[PDB]
């Protein structure tokens, strides 16, 4: 069956950036409901089960460009006082209703921490290898919820 609107699609993938494998895994997603980055959904459109291919997805069609406004300068106090607040460390801020917002520490100086709320892949072009494992129709429950049951990574 071919990948198309309102199909639940299972893929196995490898993700490389700048020639370094960053991720491998398997996931299922409901196609046509902005569940996957757009360049990848476009590359999967109309593919047959069993197809395997490689695809280059520019940042613009993946996680977007890096947004300079996602870089903030925050007090070193907001971090645990035995925390390793260091370039590359990840932390989660929380907003007024408790939503976790992940950040990566960029720099530290004095009482100030430069942090980046951008997605870690923002601004990066992604090279995928993708295999279409299974395609099926969605159930009414899945179409009503806009996602698959189960919805995400089998393996990551």
């Amino acid at each position: 069956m071919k990948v198309g609107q309102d199909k639940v699609v299972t893929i196995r993938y490898t993700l490389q950036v700048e020639g370094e494998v960053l991720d491998q895994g398997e996931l299922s997603y409901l196609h046509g409901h902005r569940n996957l980055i757009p360049g990848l959904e476009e590359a999967l459109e109309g593919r047959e089960e069993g197809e395997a291919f490689q695809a280059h997805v520019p940042a613009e069609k993946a996680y977007g460009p890096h947004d300079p406004e996602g870089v903030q300068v925050v007090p070193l106090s907001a971090f645990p006082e035995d925390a390793e607040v260091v370039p590359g460390a990840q932390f989660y801020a929380q907003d007024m209703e408790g939503n976790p917002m992940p950040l990566t520490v960029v720099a530290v100086e004095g009482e100030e921490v430069t942090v980046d709320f951008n997605h870690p892949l923002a601004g990066k072009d992604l090279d995928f290898q993708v295999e279409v494992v299974k395609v099926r129709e969605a159930t009414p429950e899945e179409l009503l919820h806009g996602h698959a049951h189960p919805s995400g990574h089998h393996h990551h």
Partner: peptide, 7 residues
Amino acid sequence: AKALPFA
């Protein structure tokens, strides 16, 4: 942003 593969 929350869209997968989400590496």
